[PDB]
Amino acid sequence: ETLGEKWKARLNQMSALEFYSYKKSGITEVCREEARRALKDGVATGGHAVSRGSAKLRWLVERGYLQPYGKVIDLGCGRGGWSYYAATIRKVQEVKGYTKGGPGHEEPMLVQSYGWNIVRLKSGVDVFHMAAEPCDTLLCDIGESSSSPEVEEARTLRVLSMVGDWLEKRPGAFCIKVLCPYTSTMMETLERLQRRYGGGLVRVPLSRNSTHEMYWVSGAKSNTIKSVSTTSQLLLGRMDGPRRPVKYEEDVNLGSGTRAV
Ligand SMILES: C[S@@+](CC[C@H](N)C(=O)[O-])C[C@H]1O[C@@H](n2cnc3c(N)ncnc32)[C@H](O)[C@@H]1O
Numbered sequence: 001e002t003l004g005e006k007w008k009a010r011l012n013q014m015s016a017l018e019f020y021s022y023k024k025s026g027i028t029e030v031c032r033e034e035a036r037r038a039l040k041d042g043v044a045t046g047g048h049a050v051s052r053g054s055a056k057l058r059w060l061v062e063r064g065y066l067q068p069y070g071k072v073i074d075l076g077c078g079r080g081g082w083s084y085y086a087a088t089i090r091k092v093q094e095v096k097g098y099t100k101g102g103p104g105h106e107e108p109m110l111v112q113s114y115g116w117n118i119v120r121l122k123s124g125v126d127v128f129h130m131a132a133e134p135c136d137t138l139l140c141d142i143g144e145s146s147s148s149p150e151v152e153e154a155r156t157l158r159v160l161s162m163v164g165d166w167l168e169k170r171p172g173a174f175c176i177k178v179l180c181p182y183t184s185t186m187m188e189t190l191e192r193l194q195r196r197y198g199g200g201l202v203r204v205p206l207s208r209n210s211t212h213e214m215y216w217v218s219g220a221k222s223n224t225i226k227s228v229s230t231t232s233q234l235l236l237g238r239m240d241g242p243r244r245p246v247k248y249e250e251d252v253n254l255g256s257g258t259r260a261v
Pocket of ligand 1: 054
């Protein structure tokens with residue numbers, strides 16, 4: 001019934017070959033070849049981003065959608081891509097990342113990118129069972145893809161409910177992954193959340209066409225229906241016609257060394 005639901009149904013009908021070309025058609029991608037090998041060879045001082053997450057956060061920050069500062073909380077930090085990137089930001093003073101880790105999940109990576117000394121990454125943490133703490137900047141990049149739109153909605157609702165307790169502590173800046181923004185009940189939930197805490201939804205072009213993920217960010221302000229519908233229509237339009245080339249880009253160089261605080 002919604003355009004996003006139409007997109008999801010069409011996505012599930014695609015052959016594996018059509019899906020493969022479709023998911024990268026006209027997207028933005030960072031070149032990670034050089035970063036992956038240095039990280040594999042244990043290079044910690046090359047300015048290499050631990051994951052392609054640093055570039056997704058950089059995209060949002062560089063466009064003014066988020067202005068990180070003070071104490072940053074990174075929920076579902078994984079290897080630490082958002083945490084290490086936030087530590088390079090002048091107004092940022094402390095970064096605390098939390099992640100599940102363990103078998104089948106990303107573990108925090110220890111690197112020496114610029115500002116690494118203000119980053120604490122904690123593994124073995126279930127953020128859904130941890131008490132919210134005050135912070136200035138709240139980041140959350142949780143939301144596992146599913147072929148079922150009901151499973152995506154249930155997972156998004158779980159993330160947004162947990163994030164609610166942290167937003168109650170009133171951070172001035174936030175960036176929250178919204179895995180499933182495209183069902184009718186999700187658009188109503190997001191409009192209510194936007195009226196209460198502000199911000200708006202943004203589509204990052206580094207996201208694959210195989211996900212409808214959007215980011216709820218403190219610096220945006222847009223009609224929920226409009227913003228989600230615009231994304232749904234872009235994703236639907238890429239399902240037909242030629243395969244468009246990927247816009248390749250240099251990955252973020254996060255420099256090296258400590259910061260004085
Ligand atoms: C998409 S990744 C984050 C990528 C990260 N922003 C980066 O730039 O490297 C989401 C992470 O959240 C973790 N995660 C998922 N559910 C979690 C939970 N209940 N508690 C803590 N971490 C969780 C996953 O293990 C995964 O490492």
